[PDB]
Enzyme design. Structure first.
Site, PDB file in Angstrom:
ATOM      1  N   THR A 159      60.008  39.944   6.876  1.00 38.06           N
ATOM      2  CA  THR A 159      60.903  38.295   6.750  1.00 38.06           C
ATOM      3  C   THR A 159      60.090  37.475   7.719  1.00 38.06           C
ATOM      4  O   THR A 159      59.571  36.380   7.310  1.00 38.06           O
ATOM      5  CB  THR A 159      62.131  38.263   7.173  1.00 38.06           C
ATOM      6  OG1 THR A 159      62.844  39.524   6.093  1.00 38.06           O
ATOM      7  CG2 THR A 159      62.823  37.058   6.858  1.00 38.06           C
ATOM      8  N   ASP A 261      67.841  39.946  -0.368  1.00 39.61           N
ATOM      9  CA  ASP A 261      67.333  41.030   0.721  1.00 39.61           C
ATOM     10  C   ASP A 261      68.514  41.876   1.308  1.00 39.61           C
ATOM     11  O   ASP A 261      68.652  43.287   1.616  1.00 39.61           O
ATOM     12  CB  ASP A 261      66.809  40.415   2.045  1.00 39.61           C
ATOM     13  CG  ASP A 261      66.411  41.294   2.992  1.00 39.61           C
ATOM     14  OD1 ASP A 261      65.244  41.848   2.948  1.00 39.61           O
ATOM     15  OD2 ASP A 261      67.096  41.535   3.928  1.00 39.61           O
ATOM     16  N   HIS A 265      68.644  46.065   0.768  1.00 42.90           N
ATOM     17  CA  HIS A 265      68.820  47.243   2.043  1.00 42.90           C
ATOM     18  C   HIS A 265      69.728  48.241   1.668  1.00 42.90           C
ATOM     19  O   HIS A 265      69.520  49.464   1.865  1.00 42.90           O
ATOM     20  CB  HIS A 265      68.796  46.480   3.297  1.00 42.90           C
ATOM     21  CG  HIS A 265      67.692  45.892   3.841  1.00 42.90           C
ATOM     22  ND1 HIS A 265      66.669  46.829   4.240  1.00 42.90           N
ATOM     23  CD2 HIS A 265      67.337  44.703   3.717  1.00 42.90           C
ATOM     24  CE1 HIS A 265      65.560  45.741   4.587  1.00 42.90           C
ATOM     25  NE2 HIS A 265      66.154  44.614   4.526  1.00 42.90           N
ATOM     26  N   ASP A 689      37.607  40.043  14.399  1.00 46.04           N
ATOM     27  CA  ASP A 689      38.243  38.605  14.105  1.00 46.04           C
ATOM     28  C   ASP A 689      38.181  38.181  12.463  1.00 46.04           C
ATOM     29  O   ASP A 689      38.737  37.194  12.354  1.00 46.04           O
ATOM     30  CB  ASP A 689      37.817  37.724  15.284  1.00 46.04           C
ATOM     31  CG  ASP A 689      36.409  37.338  15.077  1.00 46.04           C
ATOM     32  OD1 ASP A 689      35.599  37.894  14.069  1.00 46.04           O
ATOM     33  OD2 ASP A 689      36.030  36.377  15.705  1.00 46.04           O
TER      34      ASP A 689
HETATM   35  C1  LIG Z   1      42.594  31.740   9.846  1.00 45.60           C
HETATM   36  O1  LIG Z   1      42.688  30.273  10.183  1.00 45.60           O
HETATM   37  C2  LIG Z   1      42.601  30.055  11.651  1.00 45.60           C
HETATM   38  C3  LIG Z   1      42.885  28.709  11.879  1.00 45.60           C
HETATM   39  O2  LIG Z   1      41.764  27.895  11.479  1.00 45.60           O
HETATM   40  C4  LIG Z   1      41.365  30.623  12.324  1.00 45.60           C
HETATM   41  O3  LIG Z   1      41.743  30.646  13.721  1.00 45.60           O
HETATM   42  C5  LIG Z   1      40.878  29.783  14.560  1.00 45.60           C
HETATM   43  O4  LIG Z   1      39.805  30.486  14.738  1.00 45.60           O
HETATM   44  C6  LIG Z   1      38.813  29.849  15.887  1.00 45.60           C
HETATM   45  C7  LIG Z   1      37.825  31.140  16.247  1.00 45.60           C
HETATM   46  O5  LIG Z   1      38.304  32.499  16.651  1.00 45.60           O
HETATM   47  C8  LIG Z   1      39.707  29.392  17.128  1.00 45.60           C
HETATM   48  O6  LIG Z   1      38.640  28.624  17.770  1.00 45.60           O
HETATM   49  C9  LIG Z   1      38.948  28.977  19.438  1.00 45.60           C
HETATM   50  O7  LIG Z   1      39.931  27.959  19.725  1.00 45.60           O
HETATM   51  C10 LIG Z   1      40.181  28.078  21.081  1.00 45.60           C
HETATM   52  C11 LIG Z   1      41.227  26.933  21.475  1.00 45.60           C
HETATM   53  O8  LIG Z   1      42.426  27.562  21.200  1.00 45.60           O
HETATM   54  C12 LIG Z   1      43.585  27.053  21.471  1.00 45.60           C
HETATM   55  O9  LIG Z   1      43.882  25.771  20.786  1.00 45.60           O
HETATM   56  C13 LIG Z   1      44.052  25.738  19.451  1.00 45.60           C
HETATM   57  C14 LIG Z   1      44.006  24.294  18.636  1.00 45.60           C
HETATM   58  O10 LIG Z   1      45.218  23.744  18.993  1.00 45.60           O
HETATM   59  C15 LIG Z   1      45.246  26.701  19.082  1.00 45.60           C
HETATM   60  O11 LIG Z   1      45.602  26.559  17.692  1.00 45.60           O
HETATM   61  C16 LIG Z   1      45.152  28.072  19.476  1.00 45.60           C
HETATM   62  O12 LIG Z   1      46.274  28.984  19.166  1.00 45.60           O
HETATM   63  C17 LIG Z   1      46.028  30.338  19.386  1.00 45.60           C
HETATM   64  O13 LIG Z   1      46.030  30.937  20.709  1.00 45.60           O
HETATM   65  C18 LIG Z   1      47.509  30.602  21.142  1.00 45.60           C
HETATM   66  C19 LIG Z   1      47.620  31.403  22.559  1.00 45.60           C
HETATM   67  O14 LIG Z   1      47.148  30.281  23.253  1.00 45.60           O
HETATM   68  C20 LIG Z   1      48.531  31.367  20.048  1.00 45.60           C
HETATM   69  O15 LIG Z   1      50.044  31.064  20.128  1.00 45.60           O
HETATM   70  C21 LIG Z   1      48.122  31.012  18.694  1.00 45.60           C
HETATM   71  O16 LIG Z   1      48.979  32.070  17.606  1.00 45.60           O
HETATM   72  C22 LIG Z   1      46.493  31.349  18.322  1.00 45.60           C
HETATM   73  O17 LIG Z   1      46.283  32.518  18.620  1.00 45.60           O
HETATM   74  C23 LIG Z   1      45.288  33.225  17.684  1.00 45.60           C
HETATM   75  O18 LIG Z   1      43.972  32.763  17.995  1.00 45.60           O
HETATM   76  C24 LIG Z   1      43.419  32.978  19.234  1.00 45.60           C
HETATM   77  C25 LIG Z   1      42.043  32.556  19.358  1.00 45.60           C
HETATM   78  O19 LIG Z   1      42.225  30.845  19.830  1.00 45.60           O
HETATM   79  C26 LIG Z   1      43.365  34.832  19.204  1.00 45.60           C
HETATM   80  O20 LIG Z   1      42.847  35.104  20.570  1.00 45.60           O
HETATM   81  C27 LIG Z   1      44.756  35.182  19.130  1.00 45.60           C
HETATM   82  O21 LIG Z   1      44.754  36.618  19.019  1.00 45.60           O
HETATM   83  C28 LIG Z   1      45.389  34.696  17.633  1.00 45.60           C
HETATM   84  O22 LIG Z   1      44.399  35.387  16.776  1.00 45.60           O
HETATM   85  C29 LIG Z   1      44.730  27.969  21.076  1.00 45.60           C
HETATM   86  O23 LIG Z   1      46.151  27.613  21.872  1.00 45.60           O
HETATM   87  C30 LIG Z   1      38.866  27.735  21.988  1.00 45.60           C
HETATM   88  O24 LIG Z   1      38.861  27.922  23.401  1.00 45.60           O
HETATM   89  C31 LIG Z   1      37.630  28.774  21.450  1.00 45.60           C
HETATM   90  O25 LIG Z   1      36.460  28.395  21.911  1.00 45.60           O
HETATM   91  C32 LIG Z   1      35.527  29.414  22.695  1.00 45.60           C
HETATM   92  O26 LIG Z   1      34.832  30.172  21.643  1.00 45.60           O
HETATM   93  C33 LIG Z   1      33.701  29.462  21.129  1.00 45.60           C
HETATM   94  C34 LIG Z   1      32.882  30.005  20.052  1.00 45.60           C
HETATM   95  O27 LIG Z   1      32.685  29.036  19.140  1.00 45.60           O
HETATM   96  C35 LIG Z   1      32.673  28.979  22.531  1.00 45.60           C
HETATM   97  O28 LIG Z   1      31.523  28.206  21.993  1.00 45.60           O
HETATM   98  C36 LIG Z   1      33.679  28.224  23.488  1.00 45.60           C
HETATM   99  O29 LIG Z   1      32.605  28.144  24.860  1.00 45.60           O
HETATM  100  C37 LIG Z   1      34.542  29.150  23.995  1.00 45.60           C
HETATM  101  O30 LIG Z   1      34.341  30.309  24.728  1.00 45.60           O
HETATM  102  C38 LIG Z   1      34.991  30.105  25.929  1.00 45.60           C
HETATM  103  O31 LIG Z   1      35.936  31.071  25.980  1.00 45.60           O
HETATM  104  C39 LIG Z   1      35.842  32.386  25.759  1.00 45.60           C
HETATM  105  C40 LIG Z   1      37.226  33.002  25.599  1.00 45.60           C
HETATM  106  O32 LIG Z   1      38.007  32.993  26.680  1.00 45.60           O
HETATM  107  C41 LIG Z   1      34.754  33.048  26.690  1.00 45.60           C
HETATM  108  O33 LIG Z   1      34.623  34.353  26.371  1.00 45.60           O
HETATM  109  C42 LIG Z   1      33.690  32.466  26.689  1.00 45.60           C
HETATM  110  O34 LIG Z   1      32.723  32.901  28.020  1.00 45.60           O
HETATM  111  C43 LIG Z   1      33.837  30.682  27.018  1.00 45.60           C
HETATM  112  O35 LIG Z   1      34.245  30.356  28.308  1.00 45.60           O
HETATM  113  C44 LIG Z   1      37.517  28.827  19.973  1.00 45.60           C
HETATM  114  O36 LIG Z   1      36.966  27.468  19.380  1.00 45.60           O
HETATM  115  C45 LIG Z   1      40.911  28.691  16.651  1.00 45.60           C
HETATM  116  O37 LIG Z   1      41.792  28.738  17.882  1.00 45.60           O
HETATM  117  C46 LIG Z   1      41.999  29.610  15.765  1.00 45.60           C
HETATM  118  N1  LIG Z   1      43.174  28.983  15.511  1.00 45.60           N
HETATM  119  C47 LIG Z   1      44.449  29.552  15.369  1.00 45.60           C
HETATM  120  C48 LIG Z   1      45.604  28.859  15.136  1.00 45.60           C
HETATM  121  O38 LIG Z   1      44.434  31.059  15.270  1.00 45.60           O
HETATM  122  C49 LIG Z   1      41.034  32.169  11.774  1.00 45.60           C
HETATM  123  O39 LIG Z   1      39.973  32.272  12.326  1.00 45.60           O
HETATM  124  C50 LIG Z   1      40.973  32.045  10.275  1.00 45.60           C
HETATM  125  N2  LIG Z   1      40.939  33.485   9.821  1.00 45.60           N
HETATM  126  C51 LIG Z   1      40.211  33.972   9.063  1.00 45.60           C
HETATM  127  C52 LIG Z   1      39.956  35.392   8.856  1.00 45.60           C
HETATM  128  O40 LIG Z   1      39.116  33.090   8.525  1.00 45.60           O
HETATM  129 CA   LIG Z   2      62.761  38.886   4.245  1.00 44.07          CA
HETATM  130 CA   LIG Z   3      33.689  38.887  14.379  1.00 47.92          CA
HETATM  131 ZN   LIG Z   4      64.983  42.955   4.616  1.00 44.85          ZN
END
Ligand SMILES: *[C@@H]1O[C@H](CO)[C@@H](O[C@@H]2O[C@H](CO)[C@@H](O[C@@H]3O[C@H](CO[C@H]4O[C@H](CO)[C@@H](O)[C@H](O[C@H]5O[C@H](CO)[C@@H](O)[C@H](O)[C@@H]5O[C@H]5O[C@H](CO)[C@@H](O)[C@H](O)[C@@H]5O)[C@@H]4O)[C@@H](O)[C@H](O[C@H]4O[C@H](CO)[C@@H](O)[C@H](O)[C@@H]4O[C@H]4O[C@H](CO)[C@@H](O)[C@H](O)[C@@H]4O)[C@@H]3O)[C@H](O)[C@H]2NC(C)=O)[C@H](O)[C@H]1NC(C)=O
Ligand SMILES: [Ca+2]
Ligand SMILES: [Ca+2]
Ligand SMILES: [Zn+2]
Ligand SMILES: Cc1nnn(Cc2cc(C(F)(F)F)ccc2CCC(=O)N2CCC(CCS(=O)(=O)c3ccc(S(=O)(=O)/N=C/N(C)C)cc3F)CC2)n1
Ligand SMILES: [Cl-]
Ligand code: NA
Ligand code: NA
Length: 807
Positions: A159, A261, A265, A689
């Site tokens: 859910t 639901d 169950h 990813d």
């Molecule tokens: C499905 O759709 C989604 C949405 O479009 C796609 O997800 C996006 O993918 C992008 C690439 O993976 C990612 O971009 C990164 O964003 C970073 C900033 O992130 C924060 O801000 C955004 C915007 O508000 C926010 O939404 C993010 O939210 C995530 O994290 C919070 C925790 O803080 C969680 O609550 C939330 O659920 C979400 O988590 C998910 O995403 C994160 C990754 O962001 C995962 O780790 C989690 O497991 C979970 O899946 C954030 O709050 C930004 O900092 C990144 O930039 C780095 O990478 C680039 C490469 O282009 C590099 O050039 C930069 O320099 C930078 O690197 C530096 O940091 C690195 C890491 O520490 C380090 O190794 C380096 O050395 C550098 O110093 C990057 O641009 C985007 O955030 C997410 N968005 C979401 C909502 O998930 C997804 O890909 C789609 N899926 C498919 C299969 O298509």
């Molecule tokens: Ca349900």
């Molecule tokens: Ca990959």
């Molecule tokens: Zn249920």
């Protein structure tokens, strides 16, 4: 602390949440134990029930009543929903004939058609047909509006992950609600259905619809309802909000039902006890629609009737126990039930070893009803790995079964109670749920194909004129649901243009350690072969244009008699290889004299080529071919298939799979589908990813070389939807199936892999079925660039998943 001494007078079901310590009057206040002292008295009136009767018509208004039947009620917006029926001779909405809603018919002051999301927990897809006799309101919505036969939930089919996916358009791995129960190792915090941690906003990622709306100036009702608020009161509350002044009235609303639901169950999906919950949900829908009709809103509002997941037969005797497999069962923590997630009980225990746990759980019992995976090895279609809240070890549980740690967990939670559960793999038929759209913006009496719930956020944004936050839907792929407000995207621009190399290298410039018996020799046919190398058969083998490369790289288009490829100079192999196999194609062998043949490609530098010595030296790694030598059009053309530029690294265990696909299945599909076009290639996703790896993310190479090892191999298999036309001469819509096979050094996933490939390879491939869109994310390629078809139709095609389930 909550000072519950404030009052709810004039605040019942207020939309803005007042902060602590001040007391609350909103529809979640009960869940926080925060309601003001007079909330029940003022906001949860029940006196006289929910229906007008003839004796109440034109009564004197008594403010104690749950709802009103007095002459003033319509202007006040608080009539019982059956008021006009009982007191003014009107019909129930369900008794009115369907009439097409060509344009919104809204009251003055409405800026846009409102959206009401009517969400039902555990509403299995087949209830729409199987329960239709007892659900006349829902059946009118379904038959007169726009409906799918089913909607696919996200994995896990629980859910909280599904409702949040509906709200955000995101996979659970991205929004962060990866289960109903979770441990986050960074927070060192646990999320449970019971208790207070789940209220912390740090769990909830992405941007849900109510926030998207509010940020763009569109007012939203509060979507959530405390369990004790009766459904009749939830409906009356929505109807009251819809009577607010123009500057105060929300444009988007949600209703939520815990049924069917809750009963499912207890009783199983089709227990005889299930009829009454379905009847009661239908009654609720009727209250809403009668209520909208009273407000002259029934041809103004768009209504979505949507479920989160289905329901399967599950009883506690169908439980597998980890105590029957593991000696070390007290050293692990299991998240149990219809999926399993395993981690160490203690991070201080250095003896804990995931490889040993996986092996102890692999193919140990003949009818074993779960399968263990490292999360990166789960089917890519599940998109269930890229979150720290997802444990490394995952158990995919068979439908109808549970997994638990020890028997005492199941009889101390001495028999059990429940007969239904859900959570299984989201392609399982019993987990499918429902979608109906009804209103001015949806189409009339229209069936649409099944689709995934990740797509709905974009459409809900379209319905409200909102720009969606970045999400995992493919915006446009649901345009066929809508009369108006369609989203018209443009194809992405190609970033890298290809090189088209000619013959530039002599044989002796190559020192690759390769050999081939090909020294076997005509102006007629020499011109003919030059033309094939310049692209003269490309129209036959590249049916939908070349894929576009959406990132910066260096690659070459290579043409051949039987196949075309886009060859990466960086990854030293094709990004894609495209070929067409007619229904009449003949399968042939790899000739004896070519068994170990690998030929330099004189169009591609030795520096940008693979080499055979690397494969000789790497005792674990062999190679295969992307275009299959088995399907050559002629003995002379077959030599092209042994080019070094058609070679890819393959573990011998994987070659068993790949060879069977190429030698047997491609031809079978061509026979069944009247020709197929195949595009195959490597995928690199070392960080799991779901996105194309850059060169610096690659963890494994062919020993001693710069040849990167794919994590997966894909194929996209396209033919004519009208199978009376051959794939290469198709006038109309297309048909596709695809896969993303894991490139594994063993076949431990397949418990019957010692048998002939006819008994297990196709079962593997079905499990790893994929959408074209999944391959797009994983490769940075954009397919179907040059067809005759509308772009939105092609987007629908790219989101198709071939599930291999019966009807
Ligand atoms: C499905 O759709 C989604 C949405 O479009 C796609 O997800 C996006 O993918 C992008 C690439 O993976 C990612 O971009 C990164 O964003 C970073 C900033 O992130 C924060 O801000 C955004 C915007 O508000 C926010 O939404 C993010 O939210 C995530 O994290 C919070 C925790 O803080 C969680 O609550 C939330 O659920 C979400 O988590 C998910 O995403 C994160 C990754 O962001 C995962 O780790 C989690 O497991 C979970 O899946 C954030 O709050 C930004 O900092 C990144 O930039 C780095 O990478 C680039 C490469 O282009 C590099 O050039 C930069 O320099 C930078 O690197 C530096 O940091 C690195 C890491 O520490 C380090 O190794 C380096 O050395 C550098 O110093 C990057 O641009 C985007 O955030 C997410 N968005 C979401 C909502 O998930 C997804 O890909 C789609 N899926 C498919 C299969 O298509
Ligand atoms: Ca349900
Ligand atoms: Ca990959
Ligand atoms: Zn249920
Ligand atoms: C999950 C989830 N994700 N999104 N939704 C909202 C939603 C979305 C959609 C759809 F289709 F349009 F998308 C239809 C109907 C709903 C309403 C569901 C509802 O009323 N429910 C009863 C309350 C229940 C638990 C609340 S709680 O855990 O105690 C709790 C948990 C969390 C919070 S919170 O902290 O406010 N959450 C914030 N965010 C950012 C989600 C409050 C709460 F009470 C959930 C089921 N639910
Ligand atoms: Cl094997
Ligand atoms: Na080898
Ligand atoms: Na095996």
């Amino acid at each position: 602390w909550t000072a519950t001494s404030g009052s709810c007078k004039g605040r019942c079901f207020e939309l803005q949440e007042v902060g602590p310590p001040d007391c609350r009057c909103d529809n979640l206040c009960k869940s926080y134990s925060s309601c003001c002292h007079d909330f029940d008295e003022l906001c949860l009136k029940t006196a006289r029930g929910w229906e007008c009767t003839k004796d109440r018509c034109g009564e004197v208004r008594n403010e104690e009543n749950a709802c009103h039947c007095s002459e003033d009620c319509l202007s006040r917006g608080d009539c019982c929903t059956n008021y006009q029926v009982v007191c003014k001779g009107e019909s129930h909405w369900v008794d009115d004939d369907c009439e097409e809603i060509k344009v919104p018919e809204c009251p003055a002051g409405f800026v846009r058609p409102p959206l009401i999301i009517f969400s039902v927990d555990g509403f299995r897809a087949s209830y729409m047909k199987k329960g239709s006799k007892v659900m006349p309101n829902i059946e009118k919505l379904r038959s007169c509006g726009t409906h799918a036969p089913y909607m696919r939930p996200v994995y896990p089919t629980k859910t909280f992950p599904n409702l949040y996916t509906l709200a955000t358009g995101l996979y659970p791995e991205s929004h962060g609600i990866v289960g109903n129960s979770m441990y986050d190792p960074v927070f060192d915090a646990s999320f449970h259905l019971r208790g207070r941690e789940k209220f912390n906003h740090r769990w909830w990622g992405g941007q849900p619809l109510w926030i998207t709306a509010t940020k763009q100036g569109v007012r939203a009702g509060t979507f959530f309802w405390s369990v004790s608020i009766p459904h009749e009161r939830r409906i009356l509350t929505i109807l009251q909000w819809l009577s607010l002044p123009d500057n105060e009235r929300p444009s988007v609303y949600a209703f939520y039902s815990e049924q069917p639901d809750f009963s499912g169950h207890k009783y199983g999906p089709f227990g005889p006890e299930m009829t009454n919950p379905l009847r009661e949900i239908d009654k609720t829908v009727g209250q809403l629609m009668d209520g909208l009709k009273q407000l002259r809103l029934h041809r103004c509002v768009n209504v979505i009737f949507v479920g989160d997941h289905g329901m399967e037969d599950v009883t506690c005797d169908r439980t597998e126990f980890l105590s029957n497999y593991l000696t070390n069962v007290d050293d692990i923590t299991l998240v149990p039930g219809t999926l399993g997630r395993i981690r160490a009980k203690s991070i201080n225990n250095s003896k804990y070893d995931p490889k040993t746990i996986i092996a102890a759980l692999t193919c140990k019992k003949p009818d074993q009803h779960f399968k263990p995976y490292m999360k990166q090895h789960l089917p890519k279609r599940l998109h269930y790995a890229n979150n720290r809240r997802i444990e490394d070890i995952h158990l995919l549980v068979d439908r109808r079964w549970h997994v638990a740690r020890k028997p005492l967990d199941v009889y101390k939670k001495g028999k059990c109670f429940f007969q239904g559960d859900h959570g299984f793999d989201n392609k399982v038929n019993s987990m499918q749920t429902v979608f109906v759209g009804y209103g001015p913006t949806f189409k009339y009496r229209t069936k649409v194909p099944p689709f995934e719930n990740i797509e709905l956020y974009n459409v809900m944004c379209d319905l409200l004129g909102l720009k969606p936050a970045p999400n995992n839907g493919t915006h446009g792929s649901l345009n066929h649901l809508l009369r108006t407000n369609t989203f018209r995207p443009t194809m992405p621009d190609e970033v890298s243009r290809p090189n088209y190399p000619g013959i530039m290298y002599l044989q002796s410039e190559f020192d690759l350690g390769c050999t081939c018996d090909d020294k076997v020799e005509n102006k007629l046919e020499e011109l003919n072969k030059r033309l094939h190398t310049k692209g003269s058969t490309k129209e036959r083998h590249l049916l939908y244009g070349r894929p576009a490369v959406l990132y910066r790289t260096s690659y070459d288009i290579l043409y051949h008699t039987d196949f075309e490829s886009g060859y990466s100079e960086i990854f030293l192999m094709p990004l894609w290889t495209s070929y067409t196999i007619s229904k009449q194609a003949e399968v042939s062998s790899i000739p004896e004299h070519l068994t170990n043949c690998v030929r330099p490609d004189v169009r591609v530098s030795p520096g940008f080529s693979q080499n055979c010595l690397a494969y000789k030296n790497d005792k674990q790694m062999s190679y295969g071919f992307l275009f299959p030598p088995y399907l050559s059009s002629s003995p002379e053309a077959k030599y092209d298939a042994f080019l070094v530029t058609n070679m890819v690294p393959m573990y011998p265990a994987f070659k068993r799979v790949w060879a069977y696909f190429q030698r047997v299945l491609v031809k079978k599909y061509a026979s069944e589908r009247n020709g197929v076009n195949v595009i195959s290639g490597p995928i690199f996703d070392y960080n799991y990813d779901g996105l194309r790896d850059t060169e610096d993310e690659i963890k494994q190479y062919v020993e001693g070389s710069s040849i990167p090892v794919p994590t997966h191999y894909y194929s996209i298999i396209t033919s004519c939807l009208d199978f009376t036309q051959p794939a290469d001469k198709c006038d109309g819509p297309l048909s596709v199936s695809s896969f993303i096979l894991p490139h594994r050094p063993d076949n431990d996933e397949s418990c019957n892999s010692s048998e002939d490939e006819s008994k297990w390879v196709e079962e593997l491939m079905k499990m790893h079925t994929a959408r074209v869109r999944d391959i797009e994310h994983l490769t940075g390629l954009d397919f179907y660039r040059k067809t005759s078809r509308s772009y939105s139709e092609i987007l629908t095609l790219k989101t198709y998943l071939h599930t291999y389930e019966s009807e």
